[PDB]
Amino acid sequence: NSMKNIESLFDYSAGQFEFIDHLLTMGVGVHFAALIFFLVVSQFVAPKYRIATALSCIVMVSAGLILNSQAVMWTDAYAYVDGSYQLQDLTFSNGYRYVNWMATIPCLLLQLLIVLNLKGKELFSTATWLILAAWGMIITGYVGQLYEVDDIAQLMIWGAVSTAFFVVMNWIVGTKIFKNRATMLGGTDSTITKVFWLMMFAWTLYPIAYLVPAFMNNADGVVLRQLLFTIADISSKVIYGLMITYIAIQQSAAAGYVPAQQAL
């Protein structure tokens, strides 16, 4: 799929190449640093909500491994020749980001439903529909970006089908949050509403990066998309995880879990 993405179309100045490489490496570092944080604070989370913080560890490592894979594919595919980085081997594509989403998006969705205090029948059915919608969004998007060079019209059609799933997923997420925030302890009924708007903002950056080929088909666009991915990843995975943990700890403390009370 490397020859299908716009990355394969351009030579890169040293500055452009090193910046992209440094974004990807910086990203590996932020995720594995947060992995340790989530690992260590899980002992301060009541059993009720401990899976939520554990799911963040899974998200961090999954995202960190992909970003680490990308950084090495990026340096494997290009060589500095005659004053610019030129494609040598067909080994880089964003398609692996989409495979990190198939597995990480369910994890991110499930930790939200856990701290909303859903359980039993409703948790199982709500997650199934959220995961089906999210996989439909991702799959249709993955097919679309296969055409970001050869057929932009087709990228837009698949993007619109993907956006329909996205809208429906957000309608479910939003409805559940607003119908269940009253059950939330420790005043986290107020915090959960900020998480909803963080998700809305951070998750909507991905379709924007998706569209870069249509409005900035050049080497600066490749840099820009990677920049947006980096901001979207840190906000949708790292910051979102920090807030889910804070909600887990706070509710734990309000529920009589002493380590949480000790920690907070």
Ligand X SMILES: CCCCCCCC/C=C\CCCCCCCC(=O)OC[C@H](O)CO
Ligand Y SMILES: CCCCCCCC/C=C\CCCCCCCC(=O)O
Residues that bind ligand Y in the complex, under the rule CB under 6 A:
21, 25, 28-29, 32-33, 36, 51, 68, 71-72, 74-75, 110, 123-124, 127-128, 131-132, 135-136, 139-140, 143, 152-154, 156-161, 163, 207, 210-211
One of 16, 42, 62, 94 touching Cl ion (CB under 5 A): 94
Quick one: tokens of 142?
């993955």
Q: How far is the CB of 131 from ligand Y (least distance, A)?
A: 5
Is residue 156 within 8 A of residue 174, CB to CB? The reply is no
Residue closest to 31 by CA, chosen among 233, 243, 249: 233
Q: How far is the CB of 48 from ligand X (least distance, A)?
A: 22
Nearest-Å Rg of the Cα atoms of the chain is 20
Quick one: tokens of 232?
């979207």
Is residue 221 within 8 A of residue 213, CB to CB? The reply is yes
Contacts with Cl ion in 184-213 (CB under 5 A)? Answer: 210
- How many whole angstroms separate alpha carbon 166 and alpha carbon 76? 34
Find all residues with CB under 8 Å of 114, minimum gap 6, and list them. 49, 51, 52, 55, 123, 248
What does 56 bind: Cl ion, ligand RET, ligand Y, none (CB cut-off 5 to 8 Å by kind)? Cl ion
Please tell me whether residue 160 binds ligand X under the rule CB under 6 A: yes
Q: How far is the CB of 138 from ligand RET (least distance, A)?
A: 6
Q: Which residue has the tokens 């607003």?
A: 178
Please tell me whether residue 99 binds ligand X under the rule CB under 6 A: no
Residue closest to 192 by CA, chosen among 253, 129, 240, 238: 240
- Name the residues that contact ligand RET, by CB under 6 A: 101, 104-105, 108, 137-138, 141, 159, 162-163, 166, 203, 206-207, 210, 233, 236-237
- In the stretch 171-210, what mask flags binding to ligand X with x, by CB under 6 A? xx-xx--xx-------------------------------
